[PDB]
Amino acid sequence: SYHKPDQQKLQALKDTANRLRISSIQATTAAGSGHPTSCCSAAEIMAVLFFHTMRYKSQDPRNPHNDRFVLSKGHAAPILYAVWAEAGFLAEAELLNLRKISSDLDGHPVPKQAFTDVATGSLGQGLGAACGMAYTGKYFDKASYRVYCLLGDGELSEGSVWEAMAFASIYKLDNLVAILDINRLGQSDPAPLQHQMDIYQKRCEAFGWHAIIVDGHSVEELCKAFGQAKHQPTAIIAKTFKGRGITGVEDKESWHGKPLPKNMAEQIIQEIYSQIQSKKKILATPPQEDAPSVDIANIRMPSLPSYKVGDKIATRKAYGQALAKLGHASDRIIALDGDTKNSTFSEIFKKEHPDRFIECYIAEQNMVSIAVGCATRNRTVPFCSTFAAFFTRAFDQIRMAAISESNINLCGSHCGVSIGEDGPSQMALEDLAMFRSVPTSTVFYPSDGVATEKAVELAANTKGICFIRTSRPENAIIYNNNEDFQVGQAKVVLKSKDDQVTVIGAGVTLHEALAAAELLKKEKINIRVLDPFTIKPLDRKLILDSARATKGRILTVEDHYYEGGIGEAVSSAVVGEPGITVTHLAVNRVPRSGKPAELLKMFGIDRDAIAQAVRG
Amino acid sequence: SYHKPDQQKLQALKDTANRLRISSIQATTAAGSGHPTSCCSAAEIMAVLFFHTMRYKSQDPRNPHNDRFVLSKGHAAPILYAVWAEAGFLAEAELLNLRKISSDLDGHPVPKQAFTDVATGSLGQGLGAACGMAYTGKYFDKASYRVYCLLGDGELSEGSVWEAMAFASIYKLDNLVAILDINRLGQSDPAPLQHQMDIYQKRCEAFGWHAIIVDGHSVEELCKAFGQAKHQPTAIIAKTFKGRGITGVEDKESWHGKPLPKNMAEQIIQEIYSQIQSKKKILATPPQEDAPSVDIANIRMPSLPSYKVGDKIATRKAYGQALAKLGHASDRIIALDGDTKNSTFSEIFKKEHPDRFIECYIAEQNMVSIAVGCATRNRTVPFCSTFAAFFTRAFDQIRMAAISESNINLCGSHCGVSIGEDGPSQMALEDLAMFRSVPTSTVFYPSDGVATEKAVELAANTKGICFIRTSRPENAIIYNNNEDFQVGQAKVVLKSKDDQVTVIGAGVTLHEALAAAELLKKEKINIRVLDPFTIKPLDRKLILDSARATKGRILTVEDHYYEGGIGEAVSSAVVGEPGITVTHLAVNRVPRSGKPAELLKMFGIDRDAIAQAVRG
Ligand SMILES: Cc1ncc(C[n+]2csc(CCOP(=O)(O)OP(=O)(O)O)c2C)c(N)n1
Ligand SMILES: Cc1ncc(C[n+]2csc(CCOP(=O)(O)OP(=O)(O)O)c2C)c(N)n1
Ligand SMILES: [Ca+2]
Ligand SMILES: [Ca+2]
Numbered sequence A, B: 001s002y003h004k005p006d007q008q009k010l011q012a013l014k015d016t017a018n019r020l021r022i023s024s025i026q027a028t029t030a031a032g033s034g035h036p037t038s039c040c041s042a043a044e045i046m047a048v049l050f051f052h053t054m055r056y057k058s059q060d061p062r063n064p065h066n067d068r069f070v071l072s073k074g075h076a077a078p079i080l081y082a083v084w085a086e087a088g089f090l091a092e093a094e095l096l097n098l099r100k101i102s103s104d105l106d107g108h109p110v111p112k113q114a115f116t117d118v119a120t121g122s123l124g125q126g127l128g129a130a131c132g133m134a135y136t137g138k139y140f141d142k143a144s145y146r147v148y149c150l151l152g153d154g155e156l157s158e159g160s161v162w163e164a165m166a167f168a169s170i171y172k173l174d175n176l177v178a179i180l181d182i183n184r185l186g187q188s189d190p191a192p193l194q195h196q197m198d199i200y201q202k203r204c205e206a207f208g209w210h211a212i213i214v215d216g217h218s219v220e221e222l223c224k225a226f227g228q229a230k231h232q233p234t235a236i237i238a239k240t241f242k243g244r245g246i247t248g249v250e251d252k253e254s255w256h257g258k259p260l261p262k263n264m265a266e267q268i269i270q271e272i273y274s275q276i277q278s279k280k281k282i283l284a285t286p287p288q289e290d291a292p293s294v295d296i297a298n299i300r301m302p303s304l305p306s307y308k309v310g311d312k313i314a315t316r317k318a319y320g321q322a323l324a325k326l327g328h329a330s331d332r333i334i335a336l337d338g339d340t341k342n343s344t345f346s347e348i349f350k351k352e353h354p355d356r357f358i359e360c361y362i363a364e365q366n367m368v369s370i371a372v373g374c375a376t377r378n379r380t381v382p383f384c385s386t387f388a389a390f391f392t393r394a395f396d397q398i399r400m401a402a403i404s405e406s407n408i409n410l411c412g413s414h415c416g417v418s419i420g421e422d423g424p425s426q427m428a429l430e431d432l433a434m435f436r437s438v439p440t441s442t443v444f445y446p447s448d449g450v451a452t453e454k455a456v457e458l459a460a461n462t463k464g465i466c467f468i469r470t471s472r473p474e475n476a477i478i479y480n481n482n483e484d485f486q487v488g489q490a491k492v493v494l495k496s497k498d499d500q501v502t503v504i505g506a507g508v509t510l511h512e513a514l515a516a517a518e519l520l521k522k523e524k525i526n527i528r529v530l531d532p533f534t535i536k537p538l539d540r541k542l543i544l545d546s547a548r549a550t551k552g553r554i555l556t557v558e559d560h561y562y563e564g565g566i567g568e569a570v571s572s573a574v575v576g577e578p579g580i581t582v583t584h585l586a587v588n589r590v591p592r593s594g595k596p597a598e599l600l601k602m603f604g605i606d607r608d609a610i611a612q613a614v615r616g
C-alpha cells in the first residue's frame, strides 16, 4: 500500500540526497580517485529507494526477506556506501576510508560487503543478476520482496542489458524495477541518445517493459513512480544531470571518474550543506517476512551411477541424466540452458523437473548472470549449460562471477575437434584455458558416464566456479559404478611394472590413449594411462609418482589448443623435477569439418599419434 | 534504379528458391548432418538477393566492388554454397561433398571459401561484421557497394545483435540491410516472439531502423522491399516457416539441425522439383567499379621513438602516442575504442586523425566485430582498445576472429593489480591466458614507452590476432630509442658473470625485478633480468641460454593469475631441460582495492617478493 509522502518527508528525502552528495564527494576526495559526478546524478534515486520505497532490515543487509538493490553502474559505489551509513549499518567515519587497503569500501562493490550480493564494476551485468533475483523471488521463494536495479545510460549500450530486458518481459518479472540514470554523458563523450527521453521510452516499451519518464531529481516524482506496482517489469527512465548539485560541473564533459580537489570539495560541500534543512535521518522500514527457509545440507545422489563397464554413452548425455537424477535428491537444484537443451541433454532435467528449468534462449551472457543472481543468498544451486565454445561469449560474466564469490556450476558440451562435422565455430578449444584462469574454478573433465555423474555430484557440493567439460563421442564406460572420485584426484586406468611412459588423456583422448596402448602392446611396449578427472586442481602427486615409475616420461594429449590446457597445467606442475620429461600433443591451429576420427588424426591427437609419439 | 521484375523473372526466382531447397536437402542428406530446415525458410530471400538485388562478380567473390553478403545465421551454410553453385562459381557436384574432410564446404562458412569474408557459426556476430563493412563502404572506401546480412530469429536474442542495430543507426548506415528470417522457431523451442511480427517491427524501429514486414516466401514482396534505398539502415522482417516446402516438416518443432533420411529426401525432392518451371538459371549482374585501390606495403613509423632512457611514461600513454604517430605513416590505420579513449589514450589518435577514429561506445563485442568487418578484403588496418579486462566481454568475437583468419589489433590497458584503487572488476588478470589461447595470436607485453611504440609498429605489420597489453603505472624508459625489437625476441636487461637466477618480468614486474636487483646487489647477489617482449611467441632460446648462465634457475614474476600466463608459457617452454628449475610468482586470487605498490606487495609480485624469493 503506497505511503504518499508529505512535504516534510519530501524535504527529508532531498536532505538525504544532499547528504549522499556530500559523502560521495568527501570519500572520493579523501581517496584521490572515484566518480563523484556519477554518484551525484543518482542522489535522489538512492535517497528515495532507500528511505521511502524499499523494505529491508538495516542491520541485516543479507536478510532473505529484504528487497534487493543492485547497483549495476558499480562505479557509483561511494553513494551505495553512503546509503548504508545513512541507514545505520556502516559507521559514517568509515566512508572516508574509501579505496584503502585497510578498508572493505573498495572502488566498486564486492560481496565481502554484507550489503552487496554481486560484484558490478564491469558494466551491463547488474540487470541480468537482478533478473536472477526477481525470477527466484517470484517463482522459487514465492516471496514478497522486490528487486531494484540502477543502470547508467552509457551502460545501456551493452547488449547484455537488452538480453536482460527481454528475459524480464518473457518471464513477466513484475517484481523487478530498472532505474535508468539518464544523465546524458558516458565516460568520454555524451551517451548516444543524450536526453532524448522518448527514444529510451520507445526502446523499453518495445522490449515489453512499462516505461515511465521522470525528472530524476524530483523526489516526489520518484516516490510516485516507484509507488505503483505493475504487471510488467517497470523501467523508471530518469532524466538527470551528471554531477547534479556541483556548480560548474553539472552537465559538463571531462569529469567522469575525476574527484574534486580538496579546495573545491570544501567549497562545493559548503553550498550543498546550505541546502539541507535538517540533520535528522529517515529510518528504513523492515520487510514482510515471507521468504521460505532453505536447507543447507550436502546433496547426495539417491543411488550410484547405473552404467556398466563397456556400455557406450557420450558424457554430454551422462550429464543430462546425472543432473535429472540429482534434481530428485534436492529441491535447490535449478538448471538453465541457452536454447541448446537437446544437445547438452539438460532437456532430461527439464522433462523431470520443469518448474526448476529456466530457458534462457540464445543469450549466454544473460544466462550466466541469471545463474549468479539465482545463487545469491544461497537460494538455489544453479547448473547452466550450452556448448563449451559459447561460454566464451560469457567470459566477462564468468570472470565477474568469481569476483562476486559466486557458487555456480557450468557444463559446456561439444568440446574439441571430436564433435566432427560442424567445424570450429562449435569446437571448444580454449575453454580449459578460460576456466583455469578463473580464480575460484574447479575444472572437471569426466572421461565416461560414471565420472560425469560423480563430477555433477561433487560440483553441486563444491564452492566457486565449477566447470564440467562434456563431449560428443559415445565412448565406453571404463569405471565401475562404485569407484570413488574426489576433486584433485586422478586415476591410473592402465598400468604394469614395465611401463615406458605415463600417457595423460581426458575425455576422447583418454580412450584414444587406451586404444594406442592396444597398438603398442603388439610391439611389447607398455604405457601407463592416467585420467586426470580434475584439470584444476591437478593431482600432481599422482602424476609425479606415475612418471617416476615410467622412466620419468610423461606424454599429455588433449582435444584443446596448446595454451592453458592439460599439457601446460601438467608442465607447470612438474617443471624442474629431476628425470621428468613431458611431451605435449594438442591441437595446433583452427580446425575444419570432417568425421570425428578423421579430425582427431588430422590434428595429431588420435591413437596413432599417441602410439607414433611414445615410440619417440 | 530498381528493375521491377516481370512474372517470368518472378517465376525464375521461385525456381531458383526451389533449386536452392533441393540442393540444401541433397547436401545435408549426403553428409548425414546439417540444417536443411534452416536453409528452407531462407530460400526465397537467398534467391532474390543473389539473382535480383545484389550486384557482384560471380567469378570473383572477393572483388572489392561487390555488394557484400553476410550469412549471420551460419548454420544455413549449405544454401550459401548452393547460391554460389547457382551463380556459376562453384561446381554443382561439389555441393554433395558438404562437411567432408576432402572439401572446403565446411559445416559453417569460413574464409578459406572465396565467397566468405567472416566466419559465422557463433550466432549474433554477423551483423556487427556487416556494420564494419558498411561503415567502411560509406566512410572509408566511399563506394557504391551495399551490405546485406541474414539473421535467424532465435539469433536476435543475442545482445551483440542489438549493439550492432544501435551502431548502424548512430552511424546512419543507409547502405546496410538486415534481413530477419522470422521462421518462428529456434533450436529447441519456438523463438520467444514467434510470429508476432509487430513486436519485431517495434523493436527495430525503436533502435532507429526503417522496418518493413514482408511475406518471406513472396519473391515479389522481397524484390520490392529490397528495391527501395532509405536514409536509414533497413530491416526486412520476413515472416517465414522453418522447413518451408518440406511437407510434414514445415513449421514443426524437433527438426532443427536434423537432415532428411535418404528415403524422405528423395520423396521431398521429387515434390519440390515438380514445382520448378524451368531449368534455366538467372545470371548475376556485376557492380559499378568505384572502390579505391588500397596500398599493400609495410607500414613504418615516420621516425624512431623519441623517449629518453630515464623519462617516466605509462605504456597506455605510449600506445596512444605511437598509434597517432603511426596514423601519419599510413592512411589504412583506423582506431576503435569503447568509450574508454581518455584512459587507453586512443584519444590521441582521435585528435590527430578524427575521420579514422570510430567511437564504439560501451559495447566491446560489437567493437571487435566492427574491426573484423573493417579488416575484411584488407580495406583497413584496425586497432581496437579498451581496458584489457573488458576484452573478456568479447572473447567469442575474438575467438571467431581467428576462425575468420582476421588481421586485427587489440590493445588492452589497465592490466593487473598495478592499476590500484578501482579494484578487480577493472584488473585484467586473465588476458594473457585468453589471448594465448587464440590460435593465430601474437601477444606483445611492452615494458616501457619505446617497447610500446615498437610493438605498435610490429603489430601493424603482423598477420593474425595481435594483442598489446598496456599498463597504468608510469615506469622509466629503460631502452634506447634505436633498440631493435622483433616478434619472438626477448631482451636481457641486467646481467653479469656471477648471476644467481634469471628473473623474467614484464611491464610493472620487470621494473619490480630491476628494483629487486638493486636490493640484492647490496648482499652481493646478482640476478639476470629478462624482458620477454612477446609472451607468444616466447624467446625459448634466450630464456634457456640465460638459465644455463644462472645455474639453471628461472624465476618468472607476473601481474596476472597463475594459469595460462607468463609463468606457464615459460614452464611449458623449458620443462624437461636438465638442470633447469622455474619458480613462479603470480597473483593467487581475486584482488581488492589499494595503492598500486600496496597491491603489488599484498599479492606477492613486488621487489621484496622477488628479492625474498631469489634468496630461496
Ligand atoms: C564492460 C565495461 N566496459 C567499459 C567500462 C569503462 N567504464 C566505466 S564507467 C564508464 C562510463 C559509464 O557511463 P554511464 O553508464 O553513463 O554511467 P554514469 O557514470 O554516467 O552514471 C565506462 C566506459 C566498464 N566499467 N565496464
Ligand atoms: C552463440 C551461439 N549460441 C548457441 C548456438 C547453438 N545454435 C546453433 S543454431 C541455433 C538455433 C538458431 O535459431 P535461429 O536463429 O532462429 O535460426 P533458424 O535455424 O531458425 O533459421 C542454436 C541455439 C550457436 N550456434 N551460437
Ligand atoms: Ca551516464
Ligand atoms: Ca528461427
Ligand code: NA
Pocket: A407, A408, A409, A458, A459, A460, A461, A462, A463, A464, A466
Ligand atoms: Na558448485
Ligand code: NA
Pocket: B407, B408, B409, B458, B459, B460, B461, B462, B463, B464, B466
Ligand atoms: Na596486425
